[PDB]
Amino acid sequence: MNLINQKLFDFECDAYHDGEFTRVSTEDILGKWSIFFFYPADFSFVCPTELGDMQEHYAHLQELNCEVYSVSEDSHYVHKAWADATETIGKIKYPMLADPNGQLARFFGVLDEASGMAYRASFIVSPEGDIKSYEINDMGIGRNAEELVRKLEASQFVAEHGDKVCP
Amino acid sequence: MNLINQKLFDFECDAYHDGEFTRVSTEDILGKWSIFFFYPADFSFVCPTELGDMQEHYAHLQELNCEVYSVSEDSHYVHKAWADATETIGKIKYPMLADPNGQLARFFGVLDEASGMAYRASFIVSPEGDIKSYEINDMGIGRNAEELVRKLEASQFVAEHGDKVCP
Amino acid sequence: MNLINQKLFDFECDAYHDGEFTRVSTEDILGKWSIFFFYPADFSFVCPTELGDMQEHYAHLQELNCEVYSVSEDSHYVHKAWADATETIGKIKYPMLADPNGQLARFFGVLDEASGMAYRASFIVSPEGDIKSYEINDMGIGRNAEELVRKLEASQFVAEHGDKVC
Amino acid sequence: MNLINQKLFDFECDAYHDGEFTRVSTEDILGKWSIFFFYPADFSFVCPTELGDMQEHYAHLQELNCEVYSVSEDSHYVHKAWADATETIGKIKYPMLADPNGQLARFFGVLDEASGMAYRASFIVSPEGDIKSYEINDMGIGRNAEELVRKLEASQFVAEHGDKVCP
Amino acid sequence: MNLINQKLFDFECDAYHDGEFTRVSTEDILGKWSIFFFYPADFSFVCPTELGDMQEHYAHLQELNCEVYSVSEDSHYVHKAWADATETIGKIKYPMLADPNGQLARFFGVLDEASGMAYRASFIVSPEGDIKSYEINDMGIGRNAEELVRKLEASQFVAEHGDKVCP
Amino acid sequence: MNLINQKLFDFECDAYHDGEFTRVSTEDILGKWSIFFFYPADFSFVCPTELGDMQEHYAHLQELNCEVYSVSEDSHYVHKAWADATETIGKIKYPMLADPNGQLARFFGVLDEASGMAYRASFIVSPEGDIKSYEINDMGIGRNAEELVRKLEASQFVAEHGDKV
Amino acid sequence: MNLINQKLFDFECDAYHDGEFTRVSTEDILGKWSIFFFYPADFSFVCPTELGDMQEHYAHLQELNCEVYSVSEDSHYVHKAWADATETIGKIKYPMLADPNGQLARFFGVLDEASGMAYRASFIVSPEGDIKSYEINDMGIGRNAEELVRKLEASQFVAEHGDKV
Amino acid sequence: MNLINQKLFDFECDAYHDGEFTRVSTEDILGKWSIFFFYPADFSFVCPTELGDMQEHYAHLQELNCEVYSVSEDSHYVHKAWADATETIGKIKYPMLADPNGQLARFFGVLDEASGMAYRASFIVSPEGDIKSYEINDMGIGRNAEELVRKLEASQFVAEHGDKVCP
Amino acid sequence: MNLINQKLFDFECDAYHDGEFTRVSTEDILGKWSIFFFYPADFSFVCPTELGDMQEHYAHLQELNCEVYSVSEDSHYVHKAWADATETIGKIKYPMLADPNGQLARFFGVLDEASGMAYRASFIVSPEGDIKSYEINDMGIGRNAEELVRKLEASQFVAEHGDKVC
Amino acid sequence: MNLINQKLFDFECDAYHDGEFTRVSTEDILGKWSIFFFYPADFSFVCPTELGDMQEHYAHLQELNCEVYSVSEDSHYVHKAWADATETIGKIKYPMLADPNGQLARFFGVLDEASGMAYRASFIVSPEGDIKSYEINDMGIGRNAEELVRKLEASQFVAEHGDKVCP
Secondary structure: OOOOOOEOOOOEEEEEEOOEEEEEEHHHHOOOEEEEEEOOOOOOOOHHHHHHHHHHOHHHHHHOOEEEEEEEOOOHHHHHHHHHHOHHHHOOOOOEEEOOOOHHHHHHOOEEOOOOEEOEEEEEEOOOOEEEEEEEEOOOOOOOHHHHHHHHHHHHHHHHOOOOOOO | OOOOOOEOOOOEEEEEEOOEEEEEEHHHHOOOEEEEEEOOOOOOOOHHHHHHHHHHOHHHHHHOOEEEEEEEOOOHHHHHHHHHHOHHHHOOOOOEEEOOOOHHHHHHOOEEOOOOEEOEEEEEEOOOOEEEEEEEEOOOOOOOHHHHHHHHHHHHHHHHOOOOOOO | OOOOOOEOOOOEEEEEOOOOEEEEEHHHHOOOEEEEEEOOOOOOOOHHHHHHHHHHOHHHHHHOOEEEEEEEOOOHHHHHHHHHHOHHHHOOOOOEEEOOOOHHHHHOOOEEOOOOEEOEEEEEEOOOOEEEEEEEEOOOOOOOHHHHHHHHHHHHHHHHOOOOOO | OOOOOOEOOOOEEEEEOOOOEEEEEHHHHOOOEEEEEEOOOOOOOOOOHHHHHHHHOHHHHHHOOEEEEEEEOOOHHHHHHHHHHOHHHHOOOOOEEEOOOOHHHHHHOOEEOOOOEEOEEEEEEOOOOEEEEEEEEOOOOOOOHHHHHHHHHHHHHHHHOOOOOOO | OOOOOOEOOOOEEEEEEOOEEEEEEHHHHOOOEEEEEEOOOOOOOOOOHHHHHHHHOHHHHHHOOEEEEEEEOOOHHHHHHHHHHOHHHHOOOOOEEEOOOOHHHHHHOOEEOOOOEEOEEEEEEOOOOEEEEEEEEOOOOOOOHHHHHHHHHHHHHHHHOOOOOOO | OOOOOOEOOOOEEEEEOOOOEEEEEHHHHOOOEEEEEEOOOOOOOHHHHHHHHHHHOHHHHHHOOEEEEEEEOOOHHHHHHHHOOOHHHHOOOOOEEEOOOOHHHHHOOOEEOOOOEEOEEEEEEOOOOEEEEEEEEOOOOOOOHHHHHHHHHHHHHHHHOOOOO | OOOOOOEOOOOEEEEEOOOOEEEEEHHHHOOOEEEEEEOOOOOOOHHHHHHHHHHHOHHHHHHOOEEEEEEEOOOHHHHHHHHOOOHHHHOOOOOEEEOOOOHHHHHOOOEEOOOOEEOEEEEEEOOOOEEEEEEEEOOOOOOOHHHHHHHHHHHHHHHHOOOOO | OOOOOOEOOOOEEEEEEOOEEEEEEHHHHOOOEEEEEEOOOOOOOOOOHHHHHHHHOHHHHHHOOEEEEEEEOOOHHHHHHHHHHOHHHHOOOOOEEEOOOOHHHHHHOOEEOOOOEEOEEEEEEOOOOEEEEEEEEOOOOOOOHHHHHHHHHHHHHHHHOOOOOOO | OOOOOOEOOOOEEEEEOOOOEEEEEHHHHOOOEEEEEEOOOOOOOOHHHHHHHHHHOHHHHHHOOEEEEEEEOOOHHHHHHHHHHOHHHHOOOOOEEEOOOOHHHHHOOOEEOOOOEEOEEEEEEOOOOEEEEEEEEOOOOOOOHHHHHHHHHHHHHHHHOOOOOO | OOOOOOEOOOOEEEEEOOOOEEEEEHHHHOOOEEEEEEOOOOOOOOOOHHHHHHHHOHHHHHHOOEEEEEEEOOOHHHHHHHHHHOHHHHOOOOOEEEOOOOHHHHHHOOEEOOOOEEOEEEEEEOOOOEEEEEEEEOOOOOOOHHHHHHHHHHHHHHHHOOOOOOO
């Protein structure tokens, strides 16, 4: 009942990336580290703050050879309008994945079947596609981007050196 | 494999109606005739024209004791923004049902599991909750509101008089 | 649950077509646009007007490269008799499929098991056999032949200009 | 795999009887002897001399307390038109049952699934409902009405004669 | 439920034929037309007029290239003894198949499991082995040998000029 | 699958008994010792010898409070015919049960499915319905009535005498 | 469940045979007529009489090309002990098969699950392995060796003489 | 797989006890401590020193309120004969349970299905019927009666002062 | 697949708590906020710092009406020994649950069957027993006790002001 | 339901052996006699005199070509700490296997699922891998190392002596 050391399934979906639409697949994720950033709904109040704080640390994540994929059950059409409507989302340089069919949310197991929306979940995945650490929060419980960056550095530190030791 | 004379299941969902949110359920539909108007996606190009033409005939449908429920796999949050963004949607006086979990689309059987979006489907339902006639079109094949009004009048004509005859 | 982008199954079928019996199969239907016009029963009062309306629009559908196939649970024998009895049916030029098996009605999912008669349903099908746009009416609710033509014109337009790119 | 001494299932069907449509059920059939006369198709290029032959002896069967029920997969609508077209069926006085849903044909096990038409089958049923003797022929192999009358007369002969019948 | 156009299964069985015992198989039946004449019991208090009546028409059935096969759940020992006891059975020239294991009666669906005896049934079968027409009568309801000949002639003339009646 | 100390199942069947047809049921058999004497077919060569040899010991079996029931897959009509056609069979006084539906043969597990004929099997059964001792022989292997009478006496002796050495 | 004309299954087992232990298998039994003589328990009262009565007819059975195999759920160790403890059992010359695992009793369907003891059952088996004729008796019902010898002679007579009347 | 703290199933069986036959049941075993001493065969060429050795310690086991139950797949007839043949078995005063039906051996899981004999196994059981400790040895691997007594004393002193070692 | 808004199952459990053995059950856990702090193994180098960090924040979590429950697959005997051996563990005031059954690890879905050891996971649970917010780290990736406190503070805030109405 | 003459399944586990961690597998175990010594828990308030008693006789077992493998559900980490804490385990020279995932305990069927701890169980296994004799005790019922040595000595005695052993 956990996804630690589980490979990403084969998938393809629409995305929104720097003012235009693209098609992201499993092949595009391999090679770099990756953070899947699930969130409940577009045109919401709490979500923009979480996405906006992930943008601030996106350059630092880029520096650590890590891509960011924000995921919602909204379509790629809706993401574009959300970027136009709110300046916080317009500042987002990372790719915003669309998941209307729910393949991702169901694979990662973060879909609320009643609401039809993804939980506030985050997943750190290695370049080989293995899930290394993750977090699930219920709606209303906001996240901390700094901690999410720390986990990635911590996991990269263990990936490079086989035998970790305390100071 | 058809829904003629099938009762509506018990359900409850969020809606967008005259600039504010409400909760529509199966009880709210009973008593009047009803047209469920499924469409693929908000912030789209073809959809507004179909919804805008349903608005033009909404007063005439109101006159025939019939409510209109537009359905999409988008959230009620997204419908509000779509009304603000585009004047055609802002003119819509009828309730726009949200179906992110897909309960409606799956019940009526109009969900494309690949796309995660509803087909261009329309359903005419009697006041007792029985499905009387319906239409499913694939994406890109637009609808005609006039024909959809004709079917409702035609079905109401048969509902009132038990033995129909040709001229 | 819906039938969109489902291909026609393999089937053979007896039909009355323009004063003569023939055998239609899936191969004869493929290669050109198809309209499947289901209707409840021969020798009824409400059916003739629908089938007649399609014949008025049939020559136009021939130009649009589309064949019409009327279908009901009656035998082919009954179609010939119905054509001889009434002028409306007698002028029908398109083929009249017979489905006493219910194989078509059941495939299209449009049979009323209680009555053993098909609903007033219309299916638009592409040359590849893919079901593209349809409607299902209860008994008593008639159809509008002009709408079928507009839907076929519309669904053809999309097929030419892939996925509504215009 | 035979129906001897099997009671009729409770059913209801439309019928053309004496220039008018009437519903027939087991209630109506029970209490009197009954012949169920199945045949392939109305408006057949094959001459319906079988139905005519049953009419010739129908008065005989009336006086033996036996009603005749012809059955095919055609509708009651098709029966009426057949009577109006040909004099042979026009003179039919016994009820003509319609079995478009296969209800009766399937119960008796006389439906050819491939053509959707009943075989040339005759069943003699008692007032109590028990099937006493029957006959099943392929399409093209015609029947003899006088033979059916003989079987009825014979089955009645035994029906009365309980005692001193190889007890 | 319906044995029309069903091929004869593979079997062998004992039989009494014109004073001696033989072994009849499915192979021996194919090539000519065949009438399977089932009956309930040898040494029956009910005089076997049915069997004697078939004998009167046997010479005629031979000229129509058809063999007669009487069938009963009695043994072949009993068939011979029954012929030696009564003239009617002593004049029988067609083979009398014994079915103590019930393989024929069960295949044709004519066995009464309670009594362990065959119903008064008659099956007409083609040279290819296809069952073309049949009748099943309750115990005590006699048959008409003439009518079986009529059915065979009808079946044969349809076989001679099949699928070409009224161009 | 030894079938010993299994109770006789509930049934009814037709029989030919001393120039008359009768309906024998389980309740008629119960209350007294019984021997079910299965045989393959009426109007055969070996069967009458065996059945005749049982009739010679029938009066003794009756004195020992035991009834005989001969059983085959032939009907009761055939039993009557075989009785007044053959002298040996006409002399028999015990009930000749018919088993055309094969209920007795199947329950005793003595039916040859190929033939649809019972094997040459003899079953001793107590008054309580309990199957006590039996034999099953192939076709062509004749039986000995004396031996069967001996086995009844042994069964009855054991029934009465408990704690015997 | 009549078991006639069923072939003997493939097995091996221990046995005590004339003052010595042996391993008997199916292949040793095949090629000649055989009688499997089941009995409930060693060191009992009725069993030795029956086994002794078989030894009196063993030389004849041997002349008729038939071997006897007595069988019980007792081990081969117990057979040896019973042989040199009892005079009747010491005199026996045929193989005494042991069936502690119950494979023979279960296959012949002759095991009483309550006791874990075989019934008094005798099975005649042809050289080809085919079970031809048998009897199954309850505990306390003794057998007759003469009758069993007669049934062998009958079985052998039928085997040779085809189309006999 | 593990019989620790499993209650004795309900059973009755024959047994040899000090010159006479008795009937031992589960009821008779409860109330006192119990040792079930399984062994492969009576009249074994392997001298039954194991059984004789248990007898030497029997008087001691009686004073510890424990009964000894030797178990074997041999009958009770054989138990008596084996006692009359050899002094070691003739000096046995504890009951010798016969298990020809294998119910005990199968329950304890000690039967060798191939040979049909019990392994050299010993089970210690409480007055409540709970299996407290046991051993299972292959054929040819002998046992030590002293060590079984040690196990019982250990089990009893734990039972006397249970769940209160080192407060 | 996730465990959000799933109630604690009924269970009993041995624990070492502040220099003494006790028996914790579901009833003792309910009625106040719970943090379940899973960790791989006693007598390891990476675990002490995490458990020690929680003890530093434990008094603050007591004020917030939240109890901490450390869990691993070790026995209760091993927890006492680990407390005696190292000072970091010796100062632990919160109860240390033992899970040699794996009943907790399996319920929380956080056991590594290969190693038979729990992942570095933290579960926040409400007084009603509903799981509210959690995280699952692979072996080797440590945690931040401050974040757990912020999440508990955050999840409590929502619980007071129903469904984020502020 | 017993393990006599069952081969060890192929496995691998961590172990504390002679002041260091080493992996152990069937490869390492095969080729020599083996004793698997299961015990409930490290750091038990119960004195581990059993492990000490095995060490006292370990040199004896070394010279009989037999390695000792102690097993519990504790980790290898816990074994090392137990050796550093108490002198009794500090003197242990034989390998101490760790079974935190229950792999070994479940195979031998000696795991108490309710406590998650192995019973006081001892298994004697041959160089070929076959389990020759074993012992299972409840918690609290202690063992005797000298008895285990005796069983090994006995099982080896038979192992060599193939011929003239009740063949």
